[PDB]
Design a protein around this ligand. Structure first.
Ligand SMILES: CC(C)[C@@H](NC(=O)[C@H](CS)NC(=O)CCC[C@H](N)C(=O)O)C(=O)O
Ligand SMILES: [Fe+3]
Length: 329
C-alpha cells in the first residue's frame, strides 16, 4: 500500500580533495539522484552529528516558558517586530506539537551594512543566557560553519553535474552575506497527542506538515532515526528511510528555476509519528543580491527564456507563501 523511495548514499568526501575524476564520479551520482526522486544521503561528510543531536536535545529539554517568550518571533510576541525569521517558534499545548529555534548568519551584527540598511530577511540572532545554557551559542555558531563547509562542497558537485565549473554556485555562497538558516526543530512525544496538530492528507495519510517545495537552493537536513519523510513520485508518495549518520539532500525551487526544471524541486511531506525526534535543516540560501542566469541543460546552447531571479526577492516571497499554504511553524 506504500512503497519505499530509492535514496542512494553518496560518499561526498572526494568533493573536499584534489582528485578531479573522483569528483566527477560524485557529480554523476548527484545528477542521477537529482533526476530520479530528488533525494540522496551524503555520507562521509565529516560533521560530528552525535554532538549535534546531544547539544540540541539539552537545549530543547531545558528551556523554560520564560526563555521562550524572550526569544519568540513576532508571530508569538508582538514586542519583537524585528524577529521575523530568527527566534523561537513556540508550541501550543493541546493545539501545536512542534517547536523550533531558528538562527541565521552569525556575521549579521548591528555593524553589518545590511543590518544598518535594514534589508529584508536580514536579522541579528537572539540567544539564551550563557549562564542558563552554557556553551550553546558557541556550539550553534560553530555548527553553522561546519555545515556551511559541507554545503559549499555539495554545491561544487551540483555545478560539475550540470556541466559548469565547480564554483558556479559556490561563488555566490559567501560567509559575509549568506541568508542560509539553521532550524532546530523538536517533534515531541505526546500522550495524548493533540488531534489539532495532525493533518489528514487527500490519500488519508496522517501528516504533521503538508506537501511543499523547499524555499532554498539546496536543503541539507539531519534527522534522528525515525522514519517520517515522504517524496512524491508519479505513482504516489514513497517513504524515505531514515539514517541518523548522514545528511539528506534535496534541491529547492530556486534550483528548479535556474535549471528550467531540469533538477526538479521534489514535493515532499511529513507523516505523523508520535515519537520524540529531531529535524535539523540547514537551508542553503545565497546573498540578497545574488543572481544566477537561468539555463537549460537539455538544450545544446543552454538557452532559456526564464527571467533571472534575485535571490532576495525569491526568499522574501518564498517564506511568506510557505506560511500561507502550510501555516505558521
Ligand atoms: C521538512 C523538514 C526540513 C522540516 N520542515 C521545515 O523545515 C519546513 C519545510 S522545508 N521549513 C519551513 O517551515 C521554513 C523555515 C524557514 C526559516 N524559518 C527561515 O527563516 O529561513 C520538518 O521536519 O518539519
Ligand atoms: Fe521541505
Amino acid at each position: 500500500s506504500v512503497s519505499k523511495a530509492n535514496v542512494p548514499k553518496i560518499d561526498v568526501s572526494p568533493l573536499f580533495g584534489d582528485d578531479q575524476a573522483a569528483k566527477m564520479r560524485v557529480a554523476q551520482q548527484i545528477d542521477a539522484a537529482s533526476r530520479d526522486t530528488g533525494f540522496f544521503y551524503a555520507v562521509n561528510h565529516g560533521i560530528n552529528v552525535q554532538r549535534l543531536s546531544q547539544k540540541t536535545k539539552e537545549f530543547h529539554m531545558s528551556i523554560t516558558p520564560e526563555e521562550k517568550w524572550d526569544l519568540a518571533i513576532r508571530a508569538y510576541n508582538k514586542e519583537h517586530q524585528d524577529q521575523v525569521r530568527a527566534g523561537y517558534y513556540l508550541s501550543i499545548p493541546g493545539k501545536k506539537a512542534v517547536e523550533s529555534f531558528c538562527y541565521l548568519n552569525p556575521n549579521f551584527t548591528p555593524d553589518h551594512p545590511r543590518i544598518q540598511a535594514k534589508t529584508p530577511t536580514h536579522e541579528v540572532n537572539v540567544w539564551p543566557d550563557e549562564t542558563k545554557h552554557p556553551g550553546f551559542q558557541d556550539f550553534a555558531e560553530q555548527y553553522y560553519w561546519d555545515v556551511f563547509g559541507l554545503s559549499s562542497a555539495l554545491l561544487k558537485g551540483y555545478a560539475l553535474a550540470l556541466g559548469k565549473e565547480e564554483n558556479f554556485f559556490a561563488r555566490h555562497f559567501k560567509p559575509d552575506d549568506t541568508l542560509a538558516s539553521v532550524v532546530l526543530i523538536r517533534y515531541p512525544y505526546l500522550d495524548p497527542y493533540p488531534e489539532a496538530a495532525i493533518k489528514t492528507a487527500a490519500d488519508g495519510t496522517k501528516l504533521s506538515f503538508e506537501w511543499h517545495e523547499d524555499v532554498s537552493l539546496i536543503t541539507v537536513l539531519y534527522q534522528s532515526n525515525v522514519q517520517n519523510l515522504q517524496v512524491e513520485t508519479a505513482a504516489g508518495y514513497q517513504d524515505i528511510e531514515a539514517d541518523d549518520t548522514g545528511y539528506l539532500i534535496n534541491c529547492g525551487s530556486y534550483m528548479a528555476h535556474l535549471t528550467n526544471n531540469y533538477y526538479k524541486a521534489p514535493i515532499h511531506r511529513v507523516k505523523w509519528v508520535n515519537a520524540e525526534r529531531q529535524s535539523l535543516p540547514f537551508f542553503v540560501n545565497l546573498g540578497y543580491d545574488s543572481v544566477i542566469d537561468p539555463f537549460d541543460p537539455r538544450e545544446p546552447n543552454g538557452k532559456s527564456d526564464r527571467e533571472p531571479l534575485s535571490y532576495g526577492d525569491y526568499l522574501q516571497n518564498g517564506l511568506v507563501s510557505l506560511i500561507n499554504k502550510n501555516g505558521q511553524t
